[PDB]
Amino acid sequence: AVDCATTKCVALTFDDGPGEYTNRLLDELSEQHTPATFFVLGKNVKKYPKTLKRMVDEGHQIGSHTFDHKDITKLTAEGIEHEVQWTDEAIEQAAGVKPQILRPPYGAHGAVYDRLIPYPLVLWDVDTLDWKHHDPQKTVRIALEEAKPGSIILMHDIHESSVKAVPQLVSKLHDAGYTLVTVDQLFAGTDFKPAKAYD
Ligand SMILES: CC(=O)N[C@@H]1[C@@H](O)[C@H](O[C@@H]2O[C@H](CO)[C@@H](O)[C@H](O)[C@H]2NC(C)=O)[C@@H](CO)O[C@H]1O
What CATH number corresponds to the domain at position 71? Predict the structure, then answer.
């Protein structure tokens, strides 16, 4: 519904879910009427079919974070294929959709490896560092002050503070004139290709 070339857009992304906090995170997002992108771990997906179905039905985007969060630069072609495909089949069985984007674990990637990934590689330009400090106030502060039009903000769906940060983060971005979108919406009208990395 929105042209991110026209207006200030941001994509809120969450890695390494789903887990125990995902449904409450989904509650906050719903409450704020805010779509997000979840880069899910293949291995967690199998424990959370309902929750992934919920992501799809409530307008969020699901991307791949590989199966078990391994550094793809150290894997064989076989291992990478497994990382990609097992995660796809997991997501598909659980939610009925296949991911259209992949985020490489630890941001580690390279042309020779990316060639083997059937999706666009999606990185980030804002690292909230929530994985390290687990702190909702600092998560908000970094996201808010570092965000730019077209930014992709990296957060992790692995702890409480992401649930706690969303109301304040969404409120402050909105008030600053930003619209929150999925990665898909963010890249509509821009080139976005398989085996290519974007942040
Ligand atoms: C040297 C380096 O790459 N440092 C940071 C990465 O460790 C970091 O990746 C995140 O590391 C966490 C601890 O192992 C993981 O829990 C987290 O899932 C992993 N991130 C992702 C996207 O897989 C990245 C991203 O935050 O930043 C680097 O600076």
Answer: 3.20.20.370
The residue range of the domain holding 28 is 1-199
The resolution in angstroms reads 2.1
Active site residues: 15, 156
**H-only helix segments in 18-76:** 22-31, 42-45, 49-57
- Contacts by 48-55, CB closer than 8 A, 24 or more apart: 48/17, 48/18, 48/19, 48/22, 48/94, 49/93, 49/94, 49/95, 51/18, 51/22, 51/23, 51/26, 52/18, 52/91, 52/94, 52/95, 53/94, 53/95, 53/96, 54/23, 54/26, 55/18, 55/26, 55/95
Q: Establish whether residue 88 lines the binding site of ligand 1, counting it when its CB lies within 6 angstroms of any ligand atom.
A: no
Nearest CA to ligand 1 atom 9: 106
Residue 46 alpha carbon to ligand 1 centre in Å: 23
Answer yes or no: are the C-beta atoms of 152 and 15 closer than 8 Å.
no
Domains of the chain: total: 1
Closest residue by CA, ligand 1 atom 27: 106
Nearest CA owner, ligand 1 atom 20: 106
